[PDB]
Structure formats: C-alpha cells, structure tokens
Amino acid sequence: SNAEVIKELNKCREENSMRLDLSKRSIHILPSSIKELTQLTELYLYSNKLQSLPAEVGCLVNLMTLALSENSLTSLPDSLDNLKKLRMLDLRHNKLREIPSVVYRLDSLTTLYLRFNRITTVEKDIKNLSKLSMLSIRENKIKQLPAEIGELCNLITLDVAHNQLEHLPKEIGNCTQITNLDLQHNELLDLPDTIGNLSSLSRLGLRYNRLSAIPRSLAKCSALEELNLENNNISTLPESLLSSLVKLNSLTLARNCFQLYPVGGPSQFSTIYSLNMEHNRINKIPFGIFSRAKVLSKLNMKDNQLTSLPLDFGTWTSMVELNLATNQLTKIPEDVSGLVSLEVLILSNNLLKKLPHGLGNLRKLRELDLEENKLESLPNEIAYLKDLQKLVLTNNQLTTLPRGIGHLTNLTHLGLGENLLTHLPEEIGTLENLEELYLNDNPNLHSLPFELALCSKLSIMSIENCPLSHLPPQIVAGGPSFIIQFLKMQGPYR
C-alpha cells in the first residue's frame, strides 16, 4: 500500500541508506517524495506495476543503478538527464516501443538491458553511449542496426537475439573487445567480412538465421569455444575455418544443406567433444576424418543420406554416443567390433536386415535402438552385451529371438512391438533385471512362456493386438497383470 511504501521511504532517509529496494510490491504509482532521497546510489523498482517513472527520479543525481525490469513503462522522463553518474539501467520486460530519447543522453552508461520490449529502431544517437560494455536488446523488433554501432568501441557483450536483422553493419568490426555476440533467431542473410576483426570473440550466436555462407575471416576468431550454425542455408565452410578454431569444444551443423563434410580433412576435428550434423543431406563420411579426433565422443548424423559407412568405421575407438538414425544403411560392417568405448548406438529408421556378429564385442554398450528397420533375426553374439540396459527392436520383421537373449544380465527395457514373433524364448526368464517388455502388435504371438514369471521386476508389459489364443481368453481380457499372474500360479516356478 501507499503507507508501507512511505514507511520504507521514511526508513531509507532515516538510515541515510544508499540503497532503496521497492521491488515486488505491486506499486502502480511511486510517490514524488522519493526526490528527497538524494543520497541514493542504487534504486530497485523491478517487478511492480509502474506505468511511468515520476519526473522526480531526476533529483536522485547520485544514482549509479536504476533497476526497472518487469514494469509497464512506455517512456522515461527527460529529467533523467540529471543522472550524470548512472552506470546501469535495467529496462527489460517493459512496454517500450522505442528507446526513450533521454536514454540516448545518458552517456555515463556502461550497462543497458532492454530484453523483451517492442523496440523497432536503434537510432544513430546510440553512438553517444560510448561507455557501454553490455548492451542487450534481445527479443525486440529491430530490423537494422545503424553504422554508429561501430562507435561503441567498449562493447564486451552485444545481445540482439530474437530480432528481425537481415544484415549486420560492417562497422561492427570496430567493436574489437566483444567476446559475446548473440545474433541467434534473426533473419540474417549474411555476415560482414569485418567479423574477423572480433579477435576476442568466444561466443557467437548464429543459429536460426537465413545464412548461406560463413566469412572466411571468422577463422581469425580463434577464441571461439562453440560454433552452432543450426537452422540456416549453409552447405560448406570456408577454407581452414575449423582447424583455426583451436579452442572449439563443439560443432553444430544441424538443419542445414550440407551434402558432404566440410573440406579440410582430419585437422578440423582435433579439438571438439561433440559433432552434430543431423538433418542435412550428407551422402558420405570421408575415410580418415576422425583420425585426429582424440576427444570427439558424440557424433550425431541422424537424418542424412548415408548408404554405407567408411572402411575405417572400426577405428572410431573414442566414440561413446553415435546416432545414425534416419539414413539408408543396409548393413553394419563386422568392424563395428572396434567400437569398444561405445555406450549409445542409435540406428532407428534405416534398412537393416541383419546385424553382424561383431556387434557382440561392444562391451560398454548400454543403449541399442534399432526401431523401424527390416530385421529378420538377431545374431547369437548379442548375448555378450552384458552392459546393455535398453534394447529397442520396435517395428521390424523378427520371428524368433536367439536363446542367448537371456544372457543380457543388465537388460531393463526390451521393445519388441510391431514384429512377427511366433514366441518368446524360455530364456527370457534369466533376464533378472527386466522392467519393461513391449509385445504389442505381434499378430502371430499366440502364447507366452511360463518362465516370464521369473522376471521379478517386470512392471510394464504391453500386449495390445496380440492374439494370445493359447492362453485362457478371459485371462487376456484381464490385461497384462492378469496374464503374468496366471503364468506365475499355473507355472512350476513358485
């Protein structure tokens, strides 16, 4: 209420306090009496209901911090001109349709936050704020930046994510101290060649734009720690780019137009831990490209145009997670046995009819996803996958399972739905750790084995669209809990 605000105002002037916190008090109008509190250096008014800041705030000539986020402001009074020491101005989450003209006159500012307003224009007069080291105008409606952005030579962070930019002014290259430049979720058709002038750049946000190419000069930004180009129109990378990014920890080329790996050979991948290339049109992985990729442990090639794997596929000994889903692979080579560090292998939605015996040598394999292939059998050597917890075989052409399936000590999840299974093996009962067993949509599955009752942790079982005609018809009407209870009691394992 007005009273508790006046009390805090009186308390502030009675302590001669240099900070005033009136945040989160549902204030609609701030009393004029605040003008008397001229000793304030910090004023916090965020998360209130302010539709205007009173002109009297201009009397607080010693303010260095004015925090106004999460109000309903549409402007600021010209009296803020008097705030000749203000360093930080927090205006995010208001209702600004422009930067208020007085803000362009607050040349002491080093930090200006304007996230999530409705601003359409950054006027040429932005040049007046040459002390700015942090400028965030993310989540507005800005279509263009003026060339005058280049007179902000002290910028360290510039965040213009979620705007409508089609280009960047070449004068951005005068902002030589920028380490964090976020342009993601704009409409950028290109980047200026001067981007390479930003030699201290370590974070560069470019995902979700309309880019067709990356400037060769980006290779001068050798402090980049990630390069995420997801969702653009890129199909190549410029000469020697990736090998020049000596601190690159990850690379994302997902959702682009690549048909081949970027040119430059194995040296472009010697520093990254992960490589994400999903949703392109890549038709081949070059022989030898990972020969220098000593720390690369995660490779995502999902949704490409692979019809085979390179002859040195088994040399990828440091790979831990490998996603090859939604390609056109018809076989996995025997040399898969070389991938002794592999823990996750996703092969969903390919054209696989059989699996190699070498698959059984994947001793660390924890998750194997073969959903939506054409598999007519499993090799006996799957029995040696003692670390396997999740085996997804949904939607294939399996008729029987190898008896060795019961040797999968650690298996918890077995997806067998949408197959041609005529029966489960009795060895299913040695799967002591099985929890989820999906059998739905197996139209030739007319019985279940007694030894399924031996699976003590079995808590999820689906049998929809399974005839199960050898069991009592009233039991299958009772659902899985009834079927498993029947197998226990009438079975000889109790």
Author numbering: 86 to 579
Paper excerpt:
The MRAS–SHOC2–PP1C holophosphatase dephosphorylates RAF at serine 259, resulting in the partial displacement of 14-3-3 and RAF–RAS association. SHOC2 bridges PP1C and MRAS through its concave surface and enables reciprocal interactions between all three subunits. SHOC2 exhibits the expected LRR fold; the 20 repeats of SHOC2 coil to form a solenoid with an extended β-sheet along its inner, concave surface.
We also determined the structure of the isolated LRR domain of SHOC2 (residues 80–582) at 1.9 Å resolution. The unliganded domain adopts a similar overall structure, but with a modest change in its overall curvature compared with SHOC2 in the ternary complex. This degree of flexibility is seen for many LRR proteins. In both the apo structure and ternary complex, the SHOC2 β-sheet is disrupted between strands 9 and 10, with bridging water molecules inserted into the otherwise regular hydrogen-bonding pattern between the parallel β-strands.
